[PDB]
Structure formats: structure tokens, C-alpha cells
């Protein structure tokens, strides 16, 4: 990554062993559950394109997702080139060349070129742009790998209401959708898919019950 | 977060892998026991609003609580805008814009804007304001997840007084996230919910009792 140093200057630092091992482990333990996307963004703070590629390449399994991810990156790279084409010409001594889509993805650029763009004034943040594409790709994978549709999330007979509600909003997170959808869906399926012992209680609470009030109300069913 | 470096100047630092794992793990192991609120506050020392959102977003389970937390944050954002509305106008070269409720929550602000507010003179501490809102939300969750009402904590016949008292103040701690009178209920219910042989001893103690003196008496 690129870090602040003790003086004001921005310098390169090797990716740390702690971060690499942490990323490999979260993938092993959580696969492509939605919470992995935030962790990736935090672990890749300040990353060069090289560092981001290392993190993705150290994943051993899930090669279908990884190959699918490569496809999404290439689609975004092509769109970059179309909206920001490279101005062709002889390069002036000491001036930077213009990054192509493939340079941002770290495939045809060197570490020194990547550092050059990121430390320019004004900075050309090839690392931050690539991370955007990777996160766009991971979002698609989490949605594909969501195992259950909310329509199939129904409260079990002995299941505590908190656990059904936990499952409900976890599925919504992978499904992502929108906030309008998340609030329309709650006003609908959460009550109908509730257990009958809880359903009677939730129905008796009346209209306008908060999520907080229903979970307190239903703490007796066990 | 924003920290002081070896020179006097305040610079941004990446959230550490150690801190992120620590927060994820304490939630997995301890859930919403009251002591998690301290831990969050310490782990979020110097945090930007982005960092606070990162910590909350990396939590995988407990999505009911997280959705409840979002409601509390949104409620707090509206009150911020109502008491500190944004003065509208063209922005002067090199001056910062005024933060809205959504900017404090890290939804509509950039990292650089967050850093700008936190390091200004005078500082606009958007990180500290957001952390307060999050803690208000977490307090409600801890209380909701309190498994027992204080009224139902009663000493077993074979339970050492120390173990009952440990359970008693833990439950009291979960209700209202401590930060209460902590005195009216104590002078009353702790004795009434004591075991029968101990209750006679506690009743016999008389007015004024230290926690220390009563536990010794019932040893």
C-alpha cells in the first residue's frame, strides 16, 4: 500500500503478513457471505493495484467466483477505456503516461507506474478505482451465492423470534435490492412467514408496531 | 482512524487488521452483553465515520440488531439537522462545507471530507458525534437482549450469596445499560429476592449496609 510515512511524503509499503493471512482466512471461514465485502475494503485500505491482485490471487478455492470476478473486471476495464481514452503521443521527459483500463487493473502496469499515478499532484487513484470494480464484482457473487430466497424464509415452530428475524434480514442483505424493497418486504413477509404462536401476538400488536416492539413482544414463545 | 504522528501533525491511518478481528470476535463470543459497549468505544478510538461504519458492517450476524441500529442512527441524524441546519450558499475557495446528519453517519461524506472536519481548527468532530449515536443505539439493543427481568433474579437455596449478587448486578447492568439510579431498587429487591436463610440475615443487618459488609455477613 501507500502510506503517510513519518514525514508528509507518501511512500510504498509491502503488504503485511497479517493482512494477507486475515484475507485468506475470512474467505475460508465465511466464503462469499455479504459481510466479506466490507472486510475486503478495510483490509485493502491504501492498496496498490498489485496489492489488490495479490489478495485476490492468494484465494485457493472458489475459482468459479474468481473467474467470474475476472470477467466483471474486464467489462469495467473496457468501459474505462471508452470514457477515458488514452491520448496518444510521444511522452515528454519526466511526464507520466496515461493509464488504460488494463493499467488500472494492474495487468500491464508496473509497481513504479502505479505508485507514480497515485502520488501525482493531482493524484490519479488507480488503486481506488480498481477496488471499486472488484467490489462491484464481489457484490454480484454474494447475490449469486445467497442460498435461500426470502420467500423461503419462514419461522420454525421452536425457533426464537430473534433468530427468525436475524435470518430474515441476513437474506435481505445478500439479496441487497434497495431500502424501499427492504421496507416493503418487512411490512409483508416478516409477519406472514412468522410462526403461528408469534403471528397471533404480532397481529394483536396492531398497525404501526416497531421492529423493536415485535421482538420484545415475541420473547415469550421460545 | 486519525492519530498524532511523530511530528505534531494529525494524519489518517488505516484501520488495523488486529482491531477489525478483535471487534468481529468479541461480538461473536459475547454478543450484546453490556460490556461490549465499552469494548466498541475503546476499539473505535480516533475513528473516522467511515471506520465506524466499517466496524459495524463487518459484523455478519445479529442483522436484526443492525437494522434496529440503523433506525436509531437515522433518528439521530434528523435531530442533528433540526438543531444544526446547514447554511446554504456557494462555497468559498478552500473552505469546507457544513456537515449534514448523513455526512456525520458517513453515508454522504468522503474520507477526505471527514478528515477535513475532524482536523479543522476549530475541529468539527464528526467521528465522535457518530460514535455517540451508535452507542445510544447499542444501549437499546443490550437492554432488549437482557435475558431476565431483575424481578425474576432470586437466590437459590444452595446458591452462594456472592453468585446471586454477581447475577443481580449483571441483570441490573443490562437494564437501562447501567447509567441509572442504581440505588432505589438495590435497597429493596436485592434483599427481598435473597434466599430465605440469607433474607433473615440481611433483614437483621439494620439500616445502612455496604455491599462488602452484607456479603461477609452471608459468607
Amino acid at each position: 500500500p501507500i502510506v503517510q510515512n513519518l514525514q508528509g511524503q507518501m511512500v510504498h509499503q509491502c503488504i503485511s503478513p497479517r493482512t494477507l493471512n486475515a484475507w485468506v482466512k475470512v474467505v475460508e471461514e465465511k466464503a462469499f457471505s455479504p459481510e466479506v465485502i466490507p472486510m475486503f475494503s478495510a483490509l485493502s485500505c491504501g492498496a496498490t493495484p498489485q496489492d489488490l491482485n495479490t489478495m485476490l490471487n492468494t484465494v485457493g478455492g472458489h475459482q468459479a467466483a474468481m473467474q467470474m470476478l475476472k470477467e466483471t473486471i474486464n467489462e469495467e476495464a473496457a468501459e474505462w477505456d471508452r470514457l477515458h481514452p488514452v491520448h496518444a503521443g510521444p511522452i515528454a521527459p519526466g511526464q507520466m503516461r496515461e493509464p488504460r483500463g488494463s493499467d488500472i487493473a494492474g495487468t500491464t502496469s508496473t509497481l513504479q507506474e502505479q505508485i507514480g499515478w497515485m502520488t501525482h499532484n493531482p493524484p490519479i487513484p488507480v488503486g481506488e478505482i480498481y477496488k471499486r470494480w472488484i467490489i462491484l464484482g464481489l457484490n454480484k457473487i454474494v447475490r449469486m451465492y445467497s442460498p435461500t430466497s426470502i420467500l423461503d424464509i419462514r419461522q420454525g415452530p421452536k425457533e426464537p423470534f430473534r433468530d427468525y428475524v436475524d435470518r430474515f434480514y441476513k437474506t435481505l442483505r445478500a439479496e441487497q435490492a434497495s431500502q424501499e424493497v427492504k421496507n416493503a418486504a418487512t411490512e409483508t413477509l416478516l409477519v406472514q412467514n412468522a410462526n403461528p404462536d408469534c403471528k397471533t401476538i404480532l397481529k394483536a400488536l396492531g398497525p404501526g408496531a416497531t421492529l423493536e416492539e415485535m421482538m420484545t413482544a415475541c420473547q415469550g414463545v421460545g | 482512524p486519525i492519530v498524532q504522528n511523530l511530528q505534531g501533525q494529525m494524519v489518517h491511518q488505516c484501520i488495523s487488521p488486529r482491531t477489525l478481528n478483535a471487534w468481529v470476535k468479541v461480538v461473536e463470543e459475547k454478543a450484546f452483553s453490556p460490556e461490549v459497549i465499552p469494548m466498541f468505544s475503546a476499539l473505535s478510538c480516533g475513528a473516522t465515520p467511515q471506520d465506524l461504519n466499517t466496524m459495524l458492517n463487518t459484523v455478519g450476524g445479529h442483522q436484526a440488531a443492525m437494522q434496529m441500529l440503523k433506525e436509531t442512527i437515522n433518528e439521530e441524524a434528523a435531530e442533528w439537522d433540526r438543531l444544526h441546519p446547514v447554511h446554504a450558499g456557494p462555497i468559498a475557495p478552500g473552505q469546507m462545507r457544513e456537515p449534514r446528519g448523513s455526512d456525520i453517519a458517513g453515508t454522504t461524506s468522503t474520507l477526505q471530507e471527514q478528515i477535513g472536519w475532524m482536523t479543522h481548527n476549530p475541529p468539527i468532530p464528526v467521528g465522535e458525534i457518530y460514535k455517540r449515536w451508535i452507542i445510544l443505539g447499542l444501549n437499546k439493543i443490550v437492554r432488549m437482549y437482557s435475558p431476565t427481568s431483575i424481578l425474576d433474579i432470586r437466590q437459590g437455596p444452595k446458591e452462594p450469596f456472592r453468585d446471586y449478587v454477581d447475577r443481580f448486578y449483571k441483570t441490573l447492568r443490562a437494564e437501562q445499560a447501567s447509567q441509572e439510579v442504581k440505588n432505589a431498587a438495590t435497597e429493596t429487591l436485592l434483599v427481598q429476592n435473597a434466599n430465605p436463610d440469607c433474607k433473615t440475615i440481611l433483614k437483621a443487618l439494620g439500616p445502612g449496609a455496604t455491599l462488602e459488609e452484607m456479603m461477609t455477613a452471608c459468607q
Epitope: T200, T216, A217, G222 | M144
Partner: nanobody, 113 residues
């Protein structure tokens, strides 16, 4: 198991006040939520009041200004103080309490005019 019974209801004229009371078995602090619903002859059941543990009382909009709901743990009773009574208030009033599913009283008839 858990038994509920409303009482204190009857027929009063317009502009009067009345207090319904619902007696519960066991301790009332054990319930996680209680409230009041009503049904008038031929009309569908309408929601009147709710109190959930730890929360402020919530009242229906047609009654919000006029009714109050309270809980007395000493007498183990749930009170709905109907005040400023109107003709639309003629109905049967029910209390409910929820512990591991909900429970209803038999109702009390209230007729205003």
C-alpha cells in the same frame, strides 16, 4: 395456564368517563406486551391501545387524544381510562396479554349515549 378477565364495563351517557380494568393471573410484570382491542356489533375489530414492556404507551388515532392505558403491578391489573366518550365507542372491549402466545379476556360491553 394464563387467565384474563376484563371488568368494570357498562353503559354510560355521552360526555362521561369510565375506567375498564383487566385482571390477570400471575404477576403482570411477566407479560411481554398487553393492550386493548374492541369490536362493535357488525363492525370489524379495531385496535385501541397497546403497552409493550419498556416502551411508552401507544394509542389508536381515533382515541389518541381521549383514552389512556396504564398498568398497576400492585393490583396486577391493566387499566384503560376511557374519557370524553363518544357514540362510536359503543363496542365490546377486550384486553390481551402475550406470554408464549396471545391470550384474550371475555370482553366487557361499553355503550355510550
Amino acid at each position: 395456564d394464563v387467565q384474563l378477565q376484563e371488568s368494570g364495563g357498562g353503559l354510560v351517557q355521552a360526555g362521561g368517563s369510565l375506567r375498564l380494568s383487566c385482571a390477570a393471573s400471575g404477576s403482570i410484570s411477566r407479560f411481554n406486551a398487553m393492550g386493548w382491542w374492541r369490536q362493535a356489533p357488525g363492525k370489524e375489530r379495531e385496535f385501541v391501545a397497546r403497552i409493550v414492556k419498556g416502551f411508552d404507551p401507544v394509542l389508536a388515532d381515533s382515541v389518541k387524544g381521549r383514552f389512556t392505558i396504564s398498568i398497576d403491578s400492585a393490583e396486577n391489573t391493566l387499566a384503560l381510562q376511557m374519557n370524553r366518550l363518544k357514540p362510536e365507542d359503543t363496542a365490546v372491549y377486550y384486553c390481551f396479554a402475550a406470554l408464549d402466545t396471545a391470550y384474550w379476556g371475555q370482553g366487557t360491553q361499553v355503550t355510550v349515549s
